[PDB]
Design a protein around this ligand. Structure first.
Ligand code: NAG
Length: 358
């Protein structure tokens, strides 16, 4: 079965980068009042030349022209109980990432602009269009995402909640699940002036991108940092405290993208060993006041739509279990025997034997 079926947006003015219509893949589950809306990741591009490169060799992330009519749901998007213990019977939606703007953009293609950056508008239009396919009667809408999509969750969840409330759907509980989108703007390991700006100078690439995209960040965070400093709101530990919606944060303690931006490659000598240990400690520190989180001591990247997402455990608790326990806590404290805060204490990648094998 290829249960996720493509729907191009009916408002064809809400577009991928090249002006083709954006869209979503849907598996309806008419017996369920739960909705999972998943935001795909895949970095971003921050100026014309950088986006032209991406257009040459990552065109599916910039255009719907060659999207397949169907997809197979994997991980948290699987309808098989064995693969997805959490939400196998839910209404599932996969929103392809074709805006290259960390889901923040609000700029149309025009004679001035070769590319459209409409990620923030794509999300709201998908939500409105799903109201006609069952969403209006929902109990829960979980906005989930991996990598740039995880950061997209942080940047968009409260706007989805506000839009639904304002449209007359107050009984839909809007929640977020941010996977591999919780980054540190930390000092890099033995920084050099390398030419891949996105990994060599992330805060500068994000600042530049936001201007190029007419990028939008959540209001309360925007108001804290003010004009020119909206890039701050792309960093989980900064934006998270400003959010009203419940958000479950999944983050490997040694996320491959974090290590890339930190100039780290894995004998490892003292300086790098201390660097890596401090990285894990800093990440754990940022998660201390997040109620519900899952952060294993592994070197990996993304998890929630991977088929083996059920395998990793922190202190004997899997991610699907944690997510279930989170659901129970929102009936915002955990229930006895049902942990929601699962962060490894060990200090080196793969000190947890249940880490993904690569
Ligand atoms: C469709 O989307 C465009 C671009 O976001 C917007 O300006 C326009 O108002 C929308 N039309 C409708 C009918 O919603």
């Amino acid at each position: 079965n290829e249960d996720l079926r493509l729907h191009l947006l009916l408002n064809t003015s809400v577009t991928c980068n090249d002006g083709s219509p954006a869209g979503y893949y849907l598996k309806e589950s008419r017996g369920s009042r739960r909705w999972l809306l998943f935001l795909e990741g895949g970095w971003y591009c921050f100026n014309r030349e950088n986006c032209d490169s991406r257009y040459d060799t990552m065109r599916r992330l910039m255009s719907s022209r060659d999207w397949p009519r169907t997809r197979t749901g994997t991980g948290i998007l699987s309808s098989q109980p064995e693969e997805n213990p959490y939400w196998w019977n839910a209404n599932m939606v996969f929103i392809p990432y074709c805006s290259s703007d960390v889901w923040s953009g609000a700029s149309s293609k025009s004679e001035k602009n070769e590319y459209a950056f409409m990620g923030a508008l794509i999300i709201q239009e998908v939500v409105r269009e799903l109201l006609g396919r069952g969403l209006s009667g929902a109990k829960v809408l979980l906005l989930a995402g991996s990598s740039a999509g995880g950061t997209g969750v942080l940047l968009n969840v409260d706007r989805v909640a506000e839009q639904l409330e304002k449209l007359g759907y107050p009984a839909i509980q809007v929640r977020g699940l941010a996977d591999s989108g919780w980054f540190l703007d930390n000092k890099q390991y033995r920084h050099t002036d390398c030419v891949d700006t996105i990994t060599c100078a992330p805060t500068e690439a994000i600042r530049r991108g936001i201007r190029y995209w007419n990028g939008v960040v959540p209001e309360r965070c925007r108001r804290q940092f003010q004009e020119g400093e909206e890039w701050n709101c792309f960093f989980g530990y900064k934006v998270y405290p400003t959010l009203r919606s419940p958000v479950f944060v999944v983050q490997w303690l040694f996320d491959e993208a974090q290590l890339t931006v930190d100039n780290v490659h894995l004998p490892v000598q003292e300086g790098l060993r201390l660097y890596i240990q401090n990285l894990g400690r800093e990440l754990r520190h940022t998660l201390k006041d997040v109620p519900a989180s899952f952060a294993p001591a592994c070197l990996s990247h993304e998890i929630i739509i991977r088929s083996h997402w059920t395998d990793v455990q922190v202190k004997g608790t899997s991610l699907p279990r944690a997510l279930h326990c989170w659901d129970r806590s929102l009936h915002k404290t955990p229930l006895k025997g049902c942990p929601v805060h699962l962060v490894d204490s060990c200090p080196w990648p793969h000190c947890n034997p249940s880490c993904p094998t690569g």
